[PDB]
Amino acid sequence: KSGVPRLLTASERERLEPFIDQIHYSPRYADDEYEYRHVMLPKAMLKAIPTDYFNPETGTLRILQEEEWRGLGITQSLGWEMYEVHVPEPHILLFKREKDYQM
Amino acid sequence: VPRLLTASERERLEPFIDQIHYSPRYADDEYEYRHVMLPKAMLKAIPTDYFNPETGTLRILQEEEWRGLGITQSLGWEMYEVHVPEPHILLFKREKD
Amino acid sequence: VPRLLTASERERLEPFIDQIHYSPRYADDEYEYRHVMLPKAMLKAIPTDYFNPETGTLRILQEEEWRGLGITQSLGWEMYEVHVPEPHILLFKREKD
Amino acid sequence: SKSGVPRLLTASERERLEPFIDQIHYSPRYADDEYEYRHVMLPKAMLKAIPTDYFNPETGTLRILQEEEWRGLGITQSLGWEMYEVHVPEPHILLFKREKDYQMKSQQRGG
Ligand SMILES: [Cl-]
Ligand SMILES: [Cl-]
Ligand SMILES: [Cl-]
């Protein structure tokens, strides 16, 4: 519960093993102090993932601790952390335009 | 093709225009940005067809669609949104210097 | 006829562009109103001939001129001023009776 | 200032203003939407005879005067006139305006 991982049962694991080999890792891109990368589960696997692993108000997966993502089949170093993109509040509209310089 | 607001729709928005806020403009290596903040009570008055069913928030509006809502600025500003990845995509970060 | 800035003057204003603030759009019977709040420190960078020695504020500016300062807005606005009368003139008004 | 207590002139004060009352010029009446306007121009010399506490320390103009006060100066006006004052915003503030647009040009059929 946002601190304690929820261990899979024996039957859930059997349902997941078939997909383990179909998991895809993308090349990492750098930044100031962060290496980034994304994991892609095949669309079919989502039907197998436990309901309590999904965020109710979004349909995506909730942030998972290490033992949780490893149980899904993902293999990675220890330092990796799962994060979420953050959408602004509904009353803030964003705009942008191509810059104009001087000379 | 934008879906223009109606007379009666625009009239229903009137009382809120007075309080729409505009931020300064900040810029990076190639783009310029700014945000507009609408009064919270105004969202209720907005026609549902201006919203994204999945997000439960306003969809991307064309020039004429945001002008309809009472927003004024150089018409060169283009709206955009920060979209969340598909469920089957997991995002990870790592310091490790 | 506008007094265009010099490349040397324009460059001096460059760092303030991101802090210029804009107010909401207000209206009345037949006009829309709005003000722009410049960063105080910026006033020291604006050319002398852009000021008004009668009050110490910026003289009325033409669109091209205020756009040359880093102010961005929609098409249509026109800058104005408040003219204070001399000590021998008193002003009166009454709710249209 | 929560104006309330009018500072009426004394007999001597008013007596000092008399040779000036004849020349007080009143402009025509103007009007917009909410109010009606009037500009009163008094002789420049009359200002030297006016009481110091009637002026404004900062702007050096006359301070807002209650009905009983300006009437005591010799300004003959009808009931309902209030003296107003214009205000200039701080130097870093610029003012802008423009004619309000909407479906306001009614035609004979289905505007
Ligand atoms: Cl506009
Ligand atoms: Cl703008
Ligand atoms: Cl004023």
From Swiss-Prot, chain A:
GO terms for cellular component: cyclin-dependent protein kinase holoenzyme complex; cytosol; nucleus; SCF ubiquitin ligase complex. GO terms for molecular function: cyclin-dependent protein serine/threonine kinase activator activity; histone binding; protein kinase binding; protein-containing complex binding; ubiquitin binding; zinc ion binding. The keyword tRNA processing does not apply. GO terms for biological process: cell division; regulation of mitotic cell cycle; signaling. InterPro entries: Cyclin-dep_kinase_reg-sub (IPR000789), Cyclin-dep_kinase_reg-sub_sf (IPR036858). Coiled coil: none annotated. Keywords: Cell cycle, Cell division. It comes from the Eukaryota. PROSITE patterns: CKS_1, CKS_2. Disulfide bonds: none annotated. Belongs to the CKS family. Homodimer (in presence of zinc). Binds to the catalytic subunit of the cyclin dependent kinase (cdc2) and is essential for its biological function. This is Cyclin-dependent kinases regulatory subunit. It comes from Schizosaccharomyces pombe (strain 972 / ATCC 24843) (Fission yeast).
